[model samples]
Target chain A: LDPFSLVADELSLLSNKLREMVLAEVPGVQGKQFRSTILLLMATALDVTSELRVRQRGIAEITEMIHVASLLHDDVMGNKMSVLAGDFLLSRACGALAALKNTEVVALLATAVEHLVTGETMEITSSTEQRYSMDYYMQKTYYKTASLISNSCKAVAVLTGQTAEVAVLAFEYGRNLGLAFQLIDDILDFTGTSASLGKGSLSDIRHGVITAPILFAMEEFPQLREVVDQVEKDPRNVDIALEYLGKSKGIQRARELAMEHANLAAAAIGSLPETDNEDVKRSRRALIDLTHRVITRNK
Target chain B: LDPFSLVADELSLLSNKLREMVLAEVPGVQGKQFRSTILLLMATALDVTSELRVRQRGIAEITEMIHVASLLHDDVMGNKMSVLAGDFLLSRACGALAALKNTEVVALLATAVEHLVTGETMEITSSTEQRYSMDYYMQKTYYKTASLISNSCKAVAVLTGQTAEVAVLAFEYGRNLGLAFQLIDDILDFTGTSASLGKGSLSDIRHGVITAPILFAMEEFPQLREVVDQVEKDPRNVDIALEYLGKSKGIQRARELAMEHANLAAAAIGSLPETDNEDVKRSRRALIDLTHRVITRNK
Candidate 1:
């Protein structure tokens, strides 16, 4: 078996253990609620692992950290749930505002949420009223997306007792992969429709967000700035602006950029020990598959 | 020096150390921003130390946890400066609202903020929406106010290498003091004018907050609910509602309850190891002084 396969096997096991740890530590959650959360985490982790040597290194720690952190923040945004099982009446009344009460569950999730929020606020202050630029965008990307992935890579390294340098490389690989993932995501939001995506579309533009695709789109059609600027004035304008983006090559360009970063991510794994096992090869293949999927997938 | 005095001295030294830690660990803060934050924490820690042996035995650790947690959360809520530090930014800007560019920082801040929010949410949920019942109010008070103080007390205990039991008591004392402090604050908000209380006098009503005095007033004069409920319907009614609150004995009743908690806080400190030095005695006296100030002082 190759080193990569061993890494993959170890990661899968660790991921399951981490999920179990989460279920055990969180108070009062059971059944589907617990199961679904674990599943989502597993799926996301798998996707991340496929792209980077995150599991062999400590990268999983950062991933779990970000995931747990997101969950905690999600709880704050959502509503509170019952402290004990079988409290149907209380749960029902409180769960009516599920989104608002997610904040309640945050405390039980993980400490990573605190770090994420701090990082976000730091980015906010630094980027205040500033127009978008590639360097600035990359910096923002580090704060927003890659940190967790890098952390996850570091986590796996630590879990397996790898050298600190190995862990750091894993972290960097995840960071690059995360950036690629987000860039593709931004492109998808603009190019893909709601029905194909399984959720509402154009919400990002509606919310006045300036993602990479839109930012790149600005280079070709400066007039798009007027539309982007008008989003906060009325959310309905997002549809109008999105329609305009459909005519541009911004989506294609974004996909190319994502692929470029994906290459960089793959290169990062090259420095690690080579693996000959089928599982490792399959995992590596999956990582390559993800980059293409980002370019083409609807969801 | 008596044990209490020695503890007090130790707490002061620790507080100073904490300030230094904050400066060293948190990279971006300087000048007035640093001074104000440190001052606020110092005041909070001093207030907590005065009653360090009541609610829980591991008060110092609990205090440190909560205080650090709050600072972390506050950075997110007020992200203007922290983001400027640049080194701590996260990678992916997940979620719908991309008010900030960096997802990692948001994740970090959100993680800490989630704790505070969860702690508060738990308290709010347990208390049944901040109802007037003493038990519910007390529980809410602990989550919102006392938990932080208790955490501070626990932090102190940890710094001094105290037993967990002692930390717990310190936590409890801080909790009790926090409850008193909040109660007195509510009363002051109702009774004091803008001139007397500075910015806080008009804030409670304007913010649609329902505190102890308003809750108690609702018990005797159910008609007050209409005012509370309708205050938002017309901004002008806020003043009228404030007038009614001032006219009622609700403020006095709230003060009495605050005094009761303060007395309990004092008693908690009495159980701690005695100190021969005047500093500890002076600090104890200051706790009482704080109670009086909380009850009577407008600001």
Candidate 2:
């Protein structure tokens, strides 16, 4: 009944391909393939045409290629080598996308590439005041995290020859889920232990990345702005900001926001056309359960 | 008539698009749409259907986008920002490729992206023995330079609904032309002044880049290998290598190689099925002249 088990073979195929390409060492994915799992579940729930199964799997690989490519680029200090690897993955992704022979899906995923770049740019180029706005944060969050998932989900539906309206519901599910996933990830940066999180606590803060929890804390204690501004200049400012966060409803509010997105994601699934097949029903159930797990997980 | 004048309107459209997107400031292209000109010439000579005119132009823009994207990635020291810009261009190119609604053409261009990355990797990761081998140099050159041009030419032919054999001839023309173009560019790195070339002479050697001229020189003076091996360690190694090149037949031999490719490029065009129309004849003549200009131009 597990969502992942349904696509275990495809996921294994992907892992083998990644290893074959010498890209197996990239850490964050670590064989999780959460994105691929969700996509596979969506394909099953939507009753994707059997002939199109190969194409849908290609989308999942393309999704991973883009994700890992972005990570490689994020390791900008590795400089040219990182950039070259990222470019290679992207090129390979494009080749796989073309093999799908679906131009509309191609355009949808291609625009996601633009969105990823735009999101990265937004993070790098934001003004101090822009950083404080939840509006900006949410928009940037959608671009950075939600866009790929949302677009890929929509693409899967498109491949299934679903109505545009139905495809958008898939898009909505992914958009909401991606937001919740990233929200939880950001929260863990502040609350997770180094051992549990696989990295130091407050890692994003250390790198001057102001995230949802910190933004909520700033909303409550305007004085936290001073610390936020100085976080890069002084290591102690992280402690000051954390103290303010502890005093405010910041983490709780961030949790609530994540739950809201998770609920929205579930609603998107429930709103899909009814299905009678046991396989579809189970996959749908797994997708809903995934939302709950996303919010409740520790790491 | 100037070959560029034939595609003057299309070139303007590309420039306008570039300016609109804030990509006009890229230095190397600097209004020299050589690849686009060739694509357009091929389009006119092939008598492409009028309905596909817009689509063919999209291919031209895609070609430019991919070219600039590679250059941005090549400037890896700009780190994240350069990498981001390059990704942005590629995504945009993919988007353009999709809008053409031709999967074969998309695959052709997509593989070009892979070739580009592979070429760049070969440049960065070549072993000492691999670096000195002329075979390695030529293969790397094909990946780095000719692949895009060759593939794009083939794509335009496919767009015209040409037979596979005709498309291959188009590929041959671009393959040879691109090789000749890059060979001359490498020669210019040593022979042209900073004022003429717009960058410091021996810039490639300065960065430990072993190009054709140096490789050819090594054939005559085996001792030049010692200087090449030490180039990254000592500044004097560059001068010593250049001294060897001056005394040997390296630059002249490189020039000879460029001419041979230029001849091949012309021969590819000459091999096309007979064309009776003046516009087709004129574009064919201009395409041949371009090869001559490529080898003879100082910069």
Candidate 2 stretches greater than 4 Å from native: A6-10, A16-31, A193-200, A232-234, B22-31, B193-200, B231-237
Number of the top lDDT candidate: 2
lDDT values for all models:
0.49, 0.86
Question: Lowest-scoring 10 consecutive residues by lDDT in candidate 1 chain B?
Answer: B89-98
> Which CAPRI tier for candidate 1?
incorrect
| CA lDDT, candidate 2, residue A153 | 95
Q: What C-alpha RMSD separates each model from the true structure?
A: 11.0, 3.9
lDDT of 2 at B184: 88
lDDT of 2 by residue, A1-299 (tens): 66667778877876776665554643366335789988988888886445677788888889988988988998884588888888888888888888887999999999998999999999888888888888999999999998999999999999889989889999999999999999988888877844232233788888788889889988889899888888889898987888898898877888899999999999999998887899888888989988998898777
